[PDB]
Amino acid sequence: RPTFYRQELNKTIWEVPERYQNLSPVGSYGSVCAAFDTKTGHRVAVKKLSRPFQSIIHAKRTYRELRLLKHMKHENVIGLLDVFTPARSLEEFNDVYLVTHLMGADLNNIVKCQKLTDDHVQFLIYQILRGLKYIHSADIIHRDLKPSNLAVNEDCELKILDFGLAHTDDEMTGYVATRWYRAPEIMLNWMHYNQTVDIWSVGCIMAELLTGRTLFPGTDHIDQLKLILRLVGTPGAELLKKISSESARNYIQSLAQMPKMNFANVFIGANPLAVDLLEKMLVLDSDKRITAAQALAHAYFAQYHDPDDEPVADPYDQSFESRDLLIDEWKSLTYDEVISFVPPP
Ligand SMILES: CCCC(=O)Nc1nnn(CC)n1
Ligand SMILES: [Cl-]
Ligand SMILES: [Cl-]
Ligand SMILES: [Cl-]
Ligand SMILES: [Cl-]
Ligand SMILES: [Cl-]
Ligand SMILES: [Cl-]
Ligand SMILES: [Mg+2]
């Protein structure tokens, strides 16, 4: 066990191992400090979880987040550098700290402040799909892909972060970026969703890098649905059968029918191979969207695709999600995962 030291920063007590130095508050879910990790030489983000065990729902969310971060080992996905508690026993266990690489710019800063060549768009979208092939191979769904959740450095290298741990109703209301990248079947709860919702988000992101503009900036759920159906067309009877709510099906049939638009006249001047890929991502029926593994072999990525360097993930057991436990049982499972952590090479 390392030696810990205590300090009060911005009305918060931080008790951390000696290896972490020069702590400086950055953000505030949890509270975050930047620090220098003397063991590895990296600048890191240290997150102290807020009330991780106050309720059954919060205790299970803490466990879910720690299990997810411990599993992710891929160049294009955020991973876990360390996790610790100052507790010496389960009986005194109360606080959890997570340590990751400190991130700087996100894709928003690049998308709004940079002139992207088509070569930049190829490389950035390739890396998102390479990380998604890995995530999806473990039967994990990200659920919240958007420019603010994508870290990018000066060399145009990209990491996916901030997995959806199950956002609220006020958060998705009105003219807000938290909803502009969501697939229509999850935005309006049309059906049980799956990993195909992430490919819809990649299409919205790719379109925005090509044009510099948000693809579907709706002022509310219904305005956003109208923008989507104007581009991709209103649904046929085949997809209508797959929507469970009769009211939702009735609402769809209240709208005048519209054909899918010509994407070369929407994305004027774009690489014809980029136009072709967008048509294969932005498909209303989620059964028919291209998958991440299939998209990596598309000719748009010919310069970067390497089928011997696009790895899949170890199996991930999520049976805990259907389990009913008490607060102290979720807390004990979390404690076991903290003490069993083994750092990366
Ligand atoms: C913080 C540690 C995250 C991690 O393990 N990243 C990583 N990148 N590629 N691999 C295996 C090839 N593993
Ligand atoms: Cl230490
Ligand atoms: Cl990482
Ligand atoms: Cl503690
Ligand atoms: Cl965003
Ligand atoms: Cl009509
Ligand atoms: Cl597992
Ligand atoms: Mg985020």
* Residue 129: both structure tokens together: 């799909």
Dmax over Cα atoms in the chain, in whole Å? 68
Residues 4-26 as b or e (16 or more Cβ within 10 Å = b): eeeeeeeeeebebbebbeebeee
Angle, helices 327-339 vs 56-71, to 10°: value is: 20
Which residue's C-alpha comes closest to atom 10 of ligand 1? 74
Annotated binding-site positions for ATP: 26-32, 47
Range of the domain at 192: 107-301
Give me ligand 8 centre to Cα 149, in Å. Answer: 5
Q: Residues with Cβ within 6 A of ligand 1?
A: 73-75, 79-81, 344
Of residues 154, 159, 128, 167, the one with CA closest to residue 304? 128
What's the CATH number where 145 sits? 1.10.510.10
Which ligand is the nearest neighbour of the Cα of 254? 6
* Residue 116: both structure tokens together: 């992207």
Which residue's C-alpha comes closest to atom 1 of ligand 1? 79
Task: From residue 283, give the alpha-carbon distance in Å to each of 22, 132, 138, 228, 243.
Answer: 49, 18, 24, 10, 15
Distance of CA 159 to the CA centre of its chain: 10
Helices and strands of the chain, counted as H and E runs: 13, 9
